[PDB]
Design a protein around this ligand. Structure first.
Ligand SMILES: NCCc1c(-c2cccnc2)[nH]c2ccc(O)cc12
Ligand code: NI
Length: 315
């Protein structure tokens, strides 16, 4: 079986009304939110959503998708429920154009960036996948995380399907990452020190918190409670926790503060720590800077900063 194109097999694709100002696949799918999408052919993005593989492409006004179900399921267009899953994945109920104008109303820097970089929105990811992805993110770039995640999924998760030479796996369950040889194997897969955090966090969630239902509870808890709970996990501090809050636990106000956000705040906003005394990063000054951004942009500050990240990844 081959990766589909809109030309190859137009009968297997469905469409979701979606303007380019609401979503640009190319500024979202490989801009360091999910690490599981790859443009296997030009303008066609393939990756795994929940134990199914999808290919996505778009026109100026339409999002086209096709689904591969794997197990000798006779090929067919996406069902309604599968299309709802995708609609919810891209959080398309939320108007990005209205958010853009609201941020721009208070921020002339954002206003200039947003001209060129429209359609940057936040995926709504599976908490398990997002958590271990961002554990892998420490001192790491998107390309290297992407490989670590692909090798992790091939080694520990269920095979779904092969298309061309790419074999697609589901993200593993916690119990699979918690096992006695897991760290050893994960070091063999190139994760380094991060192998220890992966295994230890899997074991902590399972044994201390009662399994992945805990992550669903964090999704309904308040931002501040979810963040703090995540920071109890091995390898998860304020930055990683804010990533997971923003991207998987429905906390749009979470602003992950790292060196890159510091540089943006200083360079582009002229920000310096007020209350804090540190000239540079510190847990307190990092907290202060996240508060600065929420004060500026509002309850969707995490989405705003995502535009600036995506913008910066493009030269
Ligand atoms: N300030 C950037 C933090 C960050 C994001 C991110 C993407 C979109 C929204 N918010 C944060 N993705 C990453 C991937 C690797 C990495 O080393 C850092 C990041
Ligand atoms: Ni200065």
């Amino acid at each position: 079986m081959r990766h589909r194109t809109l030309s190859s097999s137009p009968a297997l694709w469905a469409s979701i009304p979606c303007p380019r100002s609401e979503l640009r696949l190319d500024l979202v799918l490989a801009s360091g939110q999910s690490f599981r999408w790859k443009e296997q052919s030009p303008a066609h993005w393939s990756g795994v959503l929940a134990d199914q593989v999808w290919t996505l492409t778009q026109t100026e006004d339409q999002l086209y998708c096709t689904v591969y179900r794997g197990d000798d399921s006779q090929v067919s267009r996406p069902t309604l429920e599968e299309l709802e899953t995708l609609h919810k994945y891209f959080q398309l109920d939320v108007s990005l154009a209205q958010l853009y104008s609201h941020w721009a109303s208070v921020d002339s820097h954002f206003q200039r960036v947003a001209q060129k970089f429209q359609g940057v929105r936040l995926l709504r990811q599976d908490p398990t996948e997002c958590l271990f992805s961002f554990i892998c993110s420490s001192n790491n770039n998107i390309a290297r995380i992407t490989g670590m995640v692909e090798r992790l999924c091939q080694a520990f998760g269920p095979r779904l399907i092969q298309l061309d030479d790419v074999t697609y796996h589901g993200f593993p369950n916690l119990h699979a990452l918690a096992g006695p040889e897991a760290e050893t194997h994960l070091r063999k897969l190139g994760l380094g020190y991060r192998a220890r955090y992966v295994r230890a966090s899997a074991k902590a969630i399972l044994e201390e918190q009662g399994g992945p239902a805990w992550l669903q509870q964090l999704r309904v808890a308040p931002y501040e409670e979810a963040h703090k709970a995540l920071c109890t996990l091995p390898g998860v501090g304020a930055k990683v926790a804010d990533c997971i809050c923003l991207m998987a636990l429905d906390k749009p106000q979470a602003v992950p503060v790292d060196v890159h956000v510091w540089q943006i705040a200083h360079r582009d906003y002229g920000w310096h720590p007020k209350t804090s005394q540190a000239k540079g990063p510190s847990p307190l000054a990092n907290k202060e800077l996240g508060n600065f951004f929420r004060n500026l942009w509002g309850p969707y500050a995490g989405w705003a900063q995502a535009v600036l990240f995506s913008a910066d990844l493009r030269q």
